[PDB]
From Swiss-Prot:
Residues annotated as domain YTH: 10-144
Originating species: Homo sapiens (Human)
Localisation: Cytoplasm, Cytosol; Cytoplasm, P-body; Cytoplasm, Stress granule; Nucleus
Effect of R127A: Decreased binding to RNAs
Main location: cytoplasm
Keyword field: Acetylation, Cell cycle, Cell division, Cytoplasm, Differentiation, Host-virus interaction, Immunity, Innate immunity, Mitosis, Nucleus, Oogenesis, Phosphoprotein, RNA-binding, Spermatogenesis, Ubl conjugation
The protein's role, per its UniProt record: Specifically recognizes and binds N6-methyladenosine (m6A)-containing RNAs, and regulates their stability. M6A is a modification present at internal sites of mRNAs and some non-coding RNAs and plays a role in mRNA stability and processing. Acts as a regulator of mRNA stability by promoting degradation of m6A-containing mRNAs via interaction with the CCR4-NOT and ribonuclease P/MRP complexes, depending on the context. The YTHDF paralogs (YTHDF1, YTHDF2 and YTHDF3) share m6A-containing mRNAs targets and act redundantly to mediate mRNA degradation and cellular differentiation. (Microbial infection) Promotes viral gene expression and replication of polyomavirus SV40: acts by binding to N6-methyladenosine (m6A)-containing viral RNAs.
GO molecular function, one term: RNA binding
Name the record gives this protein: YTH domain-containing family protein 2
Region annotation Interaction with m6A-containing mRNAs: where it falls in the sequence: 8-148
Top-level taxon of origin: Eukaryota
Tissues of expression: Highly expressed in induced pluripotent stem cells (iPSCs) and down-regulated during neural differentiation.
Outcome of mutating W86A: Reduced binding to N6-methyladenosine (m6A)-containing RNAs. Reduced ability to undergo liquid-liquid phase separation
Entry's family note: Belongs to the YTHDF family. YTHDF2 subfamily.
Length: 148
């Protein structure tokens, strides 16, 4: 048995990127940037958590059919940083992450987990910075950590 994830202090968000280059850059330098409202959502979650548990980011490239890994948020959002470092030159800001897990996990392994906060749509049908309820997040993390 593996009962690790079945902890009650953490928040988990889907990260959806159009750009494979951004993913590579994120892994290399341990940074990310979302949209304006996405950054705001993540920033509120990180500040409200106050170190008492992780903010997890589940990364997936739009159209790829799989998730590509997991990172933990490691800083609040700095909104005034060098522009043009990402795919689209109009992302504003930057925060630190630590990539915790880098591998492809097909959507088939996850489509049966549904998000009651998103009309019961499959977690694999989520938009950028969709938050995942903790009880569903535990199931997602378990499947990702044990896919071979
Ligand atoms: C670097 N940021 C991204 N590649 C992104 N893509 C879609 C929504 C939010 N962010």
């Amino acid at each position: 048995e593996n009962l690790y994830f079945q902890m009650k202090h953490g928040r988990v968000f889907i990260i959806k990127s159009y750009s494979e280059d951004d993913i590579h850059r994120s892994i290399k330098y341990n940074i990310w940037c979302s949209t304006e409202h996405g950054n705001k959502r993540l920033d509120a979650a990180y500040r409200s958590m106050n170190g008492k548990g992780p903010v997890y980011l589940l990364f997936s490239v739009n159209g790829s059919g799989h998730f590509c890994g997991v990172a933990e948020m490691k800083s609040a959002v700095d909104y005034n940083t060098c522009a043009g470092v990402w795919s689209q030159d109009k992302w504003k800001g930057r925060f630190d992450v630590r990539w915790i897990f880098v591998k492809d996990v097909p959507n088939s392994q996850l489509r049966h987990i549904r998000l009651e906060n998103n009309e019961n749509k499959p977690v694999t049908n989520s938009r950028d910075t969709q938050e995942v309820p903790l009880e569903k997040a535990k199931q997602v993390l378990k499947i990702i950590a044990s896919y071979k």
